[PDB]
């Protein structure tokens, strides 16, 4: 949301230079947020309303980043990268030792049982095959 704040700052600078700017002028400058703001609102609204738990948040934003509007797609894709950061941070633990960091929220992984794979919650851009490989690494490093 940083360029919206920046745009409003520049608007005040022009208002100080001359305040006789019409309202449609401001509308003309801010038309590039005029399409971006109503689109992302339903993504965030569905996240609140459905009380989403676990890895499904990643899938929900990844599905709306398949569109054909470049501002909306790039904006949601950056949020998904930020949310990838946390998953990679817990993955740095479970594959390397087996320890978890995220409690009570799913990160698509829990030697044998009490360290098994949770297959269902897994994101939609990730195949099952690589989840099997991750599960091997964690179980084995826990074993020895």
């Amino acid at each position: 949301l940083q360029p919206y704040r920046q745009a409003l700052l520049d608007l005040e600078q022009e208002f100080l230079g001359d305040p006789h700017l019409s309202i449609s002028h401001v509308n003309y400058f801010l038309d590039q947020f005029q399409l971006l703001f109503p689109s992302v609102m339903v993504v965030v609204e569905q996240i609140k309303s459905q009380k989403i738990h676990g890895c499904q948040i990643l899938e929900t934003v990844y599905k709306h980043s398949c569109g054909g509007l470049p501002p909306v797609r790039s904006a949601l894709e950056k949020i998904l990268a930020v949310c990838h950061g946390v998953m990679y941070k817990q993955l740095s633990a479970w594959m390397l030792h087996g320890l978890l960091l995220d409690q009570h929220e799913e990160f698509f992984i829990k030697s044998l049982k009490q360290f098994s794979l949770r297959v269902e919650i897994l994101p939609s851009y990730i195949p099952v095959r690589v989840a099997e490989k991750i599960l091997f690494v964690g179980e084995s490093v826990q074993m020895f």
Binding site: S92, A93, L96, H97, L99, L101
Partner: protein
């Protein structure tokens, strides 16, 4: 730190007691201190703070066990009490019991 924020506190000889952060080395230090205080009268995890610490615990315990044997001959005191208290040695049991049972 006997102020009450530290988990450890201040014959049998020691009344030092002990009764989230890795307690796996914390509880080890509590016993590793009883050993040294006796020798004076004789991901998130720690992976660079535990490294000069667990390297010291094992050295302390093994050197303390070594001192007893190679300086005070603790391994000889066992095979000393075995001669009498288990009555292993001959010329002692055959002389003690034979004299004692004549009375009763």
């Amino acid at each position: 730190d006997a102020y009450g924020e530290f988990m450890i506190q201040v014959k049998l000889y020691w009344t030092h007691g002990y009764v989230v952060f890795l307690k796996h080395i914390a509880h080890d230090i509590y016993v590793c201190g009883k050993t040294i205080n006796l020798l004076k009268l004789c991901v998130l995890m720690k992976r660079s703070i535990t490294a000069p610490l667990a390297a010291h615990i094992s050295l302390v315990n093994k050197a303390a066990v070594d001192y007893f044997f190679v300086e005070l001959h603790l391994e000889a005191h066992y095979e000393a009490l075995r001669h009498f208290l288990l009555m292993e040695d001959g010329e002692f049991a055959q002389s003690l019991s034979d004299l004692l049972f004549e009375k009763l």
